[PDB]
Structures are given as structure tokens and as C-alpha cells.
Amino acid sequence: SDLGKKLLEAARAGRDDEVRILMANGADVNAADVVGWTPLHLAAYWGHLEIVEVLLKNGADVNAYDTLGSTPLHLAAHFGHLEIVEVLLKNGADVNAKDDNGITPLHLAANRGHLEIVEVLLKYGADVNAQDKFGKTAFDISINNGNEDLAEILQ
Amino acid sequence: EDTPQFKIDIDQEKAQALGVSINDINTTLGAAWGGSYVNDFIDRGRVK
Amino acid sequence: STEEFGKILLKVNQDGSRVLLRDVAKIELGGENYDIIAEFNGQPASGL
């Protein structure tokens, strides 16, 4: 897609006004690059909140997953983008989505010590006992990393 | 510009539990996917 | 970071518990050496 590509580039770049015009012209919100990232993936990774919102209004798949099973929520949680985490969840993001390694948004937020994001994930039903492929929980991560504050949150 | 890249994390605990050395893992990964200059040989009188 | 050095995994005990580097050492950003200490008019200083 000509306009799908342009949209991928614009979502990544955070070019807000360019995303708008592209939405007006029917640029494919479910365009995917070679690694399976949608515009929503891109905007989530790079922390572009307004663009996330616009894409969701225009019927972006909130639980699109990449070629390794990661979702926009995974990326927003991992890279500390609280508002985007909230927006995604409000729009039905699977709070317990596992990637191909059995890693969840909670695992990722925990690993980077993003306290507020962990609480939001928990508030929306994040499974605190979910294990990755190595049998590890967000709690295990917090302990290994020596994050006392995050350990206390995860009882 | 920045481009997509494939981040692979070796799990140290599991490796130790299985008795697999980190050096073997990294050599195997790097030799196979990146290539490795081992040493020289002599091709019709020229070192290569 | 000190945090990353702290969680270097030294070994797993028979009972499955983990020995991390921070369990056998204190970890900090500090000097390559601690021999040379300067003052300027009585106050802490460095210099070239």
C-alpha cells in the first residue's frame, strides 16, 4: 500500500497533521511492515499519544501482534508510556497478551521498573502470576532486579 | 535512520542449569550468523 | 549501571537459589584509582 507505507512513516515520525490527512484519505490503519508492526505499534513504541488515539478512532486493531507475538501494549508498557498504556487499555487491549516467549506487558513494565504502568496494568486485570517461558513472574523480575518498591506492589 | 533489529536475550540462569557455556552460545550464534575469521591458509603461494 | 552489575549471576545452588554478584560484593561507581585528591583553596576540586 502506497498510503499504508506513508502512514507507517508518519506514525513513527509523530507527524500529527500528516496522519490526519492520511486518515481522511483512507490510508490502511492495518498496514504492516516486514516485522509485523502496524502504525499503532510504531506510535506506541515512539510514544506518540495523539496518533495512538486517532488510529484507534479509525479502527486500528488494538491487539495487532508482530512476527514475534508482541502487541502495542507490550511496547507502550516496556518504554514507559503511561498515557498510551491507559488509552490502549481503555480501547480493549489484551492486558495479558503473551508474546512468543510468554512475556506480558506486566513482565516488561516490571523489568524496566515502571511503577505507575504496573499499577495501571494491575488495575485492568493483569495476571500477577503469569509466567514467561522460563517460569518467571513480574515478582521474580522485581526480586532479581532488586526493585524493592516494585516488589512490595506485587506483594 | 534507525531501523528494526532483532534483540535476542540469553537467559543466564537456564544456560547454567543446562550446563551450556556462554562462550559456546555466543560463538555458535556469531560464527553461524555473523561469520568468523579463523586463520590463514596458502592458496597457490598467496596467504588468504 | 550498578544495578546490572549487581544481578550478574555467579551461580545457582543445588537447592535452586541464585548467587548474584551483589551477594558477594558492594557495587559502586568509583575511581579507577583513589590516589590523587585535589583541593582548591581548601575546597574539593579536580583539575588538568
UniProtKB/Swiss-Prot annotation, chain C:
Cellular location of this protein?
Answer: Cell inner membrane
Lineage top rank: taxon: Bacteria
Any coiled-coil regions, as ranges: none
Question: Which factors induce or repress this protein, as stated in its UniProt record?
Answer: Positively regulated by MarA, Rob and SoxS transcriptional regulators (at protein level).
Null mutant phenotype reads: Loss of susceptibility to contact-dependent growth inhibition (CDI); inhibiting cells still contact the target.
Q: Main role? A: AcrA-AcrB-AcrZ-TolC is a drug efflux protein complex with broad substrate specificity that uses the proton motive force to export substrates.
How does this chain assemble? Homotrimer, with large domains that extend into the periplasm, interacts with AcrA and TolC. AcrA may be required to stably link this protein and TolC. Interacts with AcrZ. Part of the AcrA-AcrB-AcrZ-TolC efflux pump.
Q: Which family does it belong to?
A: Belongs to the resistance-nodulation-cell division (RND) (TC 2.A.6) family.
Identify this protein by name: Multidrug efflux pump subunit AcrB
Species of the source: Escherichia coli (strain K12)
- Parent sequence residues shown: 242 to 289 of 1049
